[PDB]
Amino acid sequence: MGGEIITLQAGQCGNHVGKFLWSQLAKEHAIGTDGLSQLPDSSTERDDDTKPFFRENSRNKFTPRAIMMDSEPSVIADVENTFRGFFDPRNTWVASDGASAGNSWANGYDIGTRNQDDILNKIDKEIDSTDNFEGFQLLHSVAGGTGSGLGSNLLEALCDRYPKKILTTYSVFPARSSEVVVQSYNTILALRRLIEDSDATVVFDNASLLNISGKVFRNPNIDLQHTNQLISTIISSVTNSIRFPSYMYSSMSSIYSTLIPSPELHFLSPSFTPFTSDYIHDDIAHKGHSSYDVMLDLLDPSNSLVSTAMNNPTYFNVYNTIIGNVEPRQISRAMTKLQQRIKFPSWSSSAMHVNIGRRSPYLPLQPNENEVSGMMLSNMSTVVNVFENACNTFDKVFAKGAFLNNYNVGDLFQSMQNVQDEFAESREVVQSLMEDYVAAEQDSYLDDVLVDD
Amino acid sequence: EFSKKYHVLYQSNSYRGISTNFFEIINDQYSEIVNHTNQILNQKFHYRDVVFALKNILLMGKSDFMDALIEKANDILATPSDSLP
Numbered sequence A: 001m002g003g004e005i006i007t008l009q010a011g012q013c014g015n016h017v018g019k020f021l022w023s024q025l026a027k028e029h030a031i032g033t034d035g036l037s038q039l040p041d042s043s044t045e046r047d048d049d050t051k052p053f054f055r056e057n058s059r060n061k062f063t064p065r066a067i068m069m070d071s072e073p074s075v076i077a078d079v080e081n082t083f084r085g086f087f088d089p090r091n092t093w094v095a096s097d098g099a100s101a102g103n104s105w106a107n108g109y110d111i112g113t114r115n116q117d118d119i120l121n122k123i124d125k126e127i128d129s130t131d132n133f134e135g136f137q138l139l140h141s142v143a144g145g146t147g148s149g150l151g152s153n154l155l156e157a158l159c160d161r162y163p164k165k166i167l168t169t170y171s172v173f174p175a176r177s178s179e180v181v182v183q184s185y186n187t188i189l190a191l192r193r194l195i196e197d198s199d200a201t202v203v204f205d206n207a208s209l210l211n212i213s214g215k216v217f218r219n220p221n222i223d224l225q226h227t228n229q230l231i232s233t234i235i236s237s238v239t240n241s242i243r244f245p246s247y248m249y250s251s252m253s254s255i256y257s258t259l260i261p262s263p264e265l266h267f268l269s270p271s272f273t274p275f276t277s278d279y280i281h282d283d284i285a286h287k288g289h290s291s292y293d294v295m296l297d298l299l300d301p302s303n304s305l306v307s308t309a310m311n312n313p314t315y316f317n318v319y320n321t322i323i324g325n326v327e328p329r330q331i332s333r334a335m336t337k338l339q340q341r342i343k344f345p346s347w348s349s350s351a352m353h354v355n356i357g358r359r360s361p362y363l364p365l366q367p368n369e370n371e372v373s374g375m376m377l378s379n380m381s382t383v384v385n386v387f388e389n390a391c392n393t394f395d396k397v398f399a400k401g402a403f404l405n406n407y408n409v410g411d412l413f414q415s416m417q418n419v420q421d422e423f424a425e426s427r428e429v430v431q432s433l434m435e436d437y438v439a440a441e442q443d444s445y446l447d448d449v450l451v452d453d
Numbered sequence B: 001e002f003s004k005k006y007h008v009l010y011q012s013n014s015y016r017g018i019s020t021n022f023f024e025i026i027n028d029q030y031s032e033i034v035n036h037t038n039q040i041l042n043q044k045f046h047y048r049d050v051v052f053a054l055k056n057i058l059l060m061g062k063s064d065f066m067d068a069l070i071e072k073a074n075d076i077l078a079t080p081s082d083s084l085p
């Protein structure tokens, strides 16, 4: 049931996190920044599997199965120059359309619609270079308007172009916005398509990112690159279940089976202990923690990568993947303690799920204090809170219609009325999504199938 | 070569009959030959590797390969297999 997955870099943040993720994967699989595997191709026995994400043209070279898409050629050229020969130049899309004319979602949607033929041709060509394919992993960067529009365009193309492929998505939300109206509008327009077509979506609120980067790093000033490093390490840890396949979860579809209770609830809440492959990772051997402490930290709000807003939060699918030399008795003890310390909906007796991963034989081994790490993903309704304030912005700005002269160009509708209607429809869609999420927080949700048969 | 060596050894130990030298030569012979068989089996036959392969194949120790075979032959398994060439 295991298939290959292709990475999709959309927007400047998307391209940066893709660069960081591919550098992290090259570090784990000893591939480096040159595209040539740092290990000699004479050792055929490899416990990992680069094939789902690396195409192998020459025996020592593994080309990352990813496409670089952006409107700003400067960042693409920079990433290509840093990663000499690592990426494929034919998979770098810029459309030569110049810089983005603003941060409007409509601009990105238009630049994706006009150049849809080229990107679809590139995607089909990449599919031709593979045989067993399962789905894509899209990086939205919804904080940017052009990036969000491009992501929505790719989603609207791939939903009907490949309905038999599972499409997971990664939306990065900012903490504070200089003009909350424009970014809120872009995120709402992207979330509309996320609810419509996206099969799986992982949110990334930048507030917890800034907090963690200020806590674990020594420098008080926070740089965007090592912040994207967090998301890249997260994506590598989650993909470890396929790159370093375990004995329980061996396919992204199987992973989403225990994480997607229904196509409606497809937004997850992440959490991760203090990382070890980041820049300032020397202050990790002084923690002296165990696997039970790792699980506690995974359940702690200080290690969640999104705005917690924990006011008796309802969980739906709590799962975790633990990488390192893990002990089963500590796992059982942690499960016992957490089942006594986690709110569960009374209509479902399904508890949290624990998975154990393996460490790479070429990754730098850490001391016995932080030698084992873990990632946690919990289906929580509090994610809509991240949108709630956003909708609040909508609910307090849509009465007038500011910045309307910028979403009228590019899209198919130049009139104010049609754009207003589309925004009202997107607001209604996100309202219905929040209503579904708040109804899932009740037992009457499951009782709906009991009252009628 | 082992037979020739320990035969010369026992020939040197023939005048004693039943002695402790006989027993210690037997013990050295057993230890050496057992270590040698273990080495030969782990190198030329990959004993522990064979055990790992059997655990991953028959005991389904490798979920990835099992899922691969399942997605490969699900069409044939779903169809009746009364006649299998």
Ligand SMILES: Nc1nc2c(ncn2[C@@H]2O[C@H](COP(=O)(O)OP(=O)(O)OP(=O)(O)O)[C@@H](O)[C@H]2O)c(=O)[nH]1
Pocket: A010, A011, A012, A013, A014, A016, A070, A071, A072, A075, A100, A102, A103, A141, A143, A144, A145, A146, A147, A173, A174, A206, A224, A225, A227, A228
């Ligand atoms: N944390 C973090 N956020 C980023 C980073 N790069 C971009 N972003 C987010 O993206 C928003 C700015 O938009 P861009 O990513 O540049 O998208 P754009 O404006 O269309 O520009 P291009 O993507 O180059 O076309 C900011 O509000 C950030 O939240 C990054 O490196 N780290």
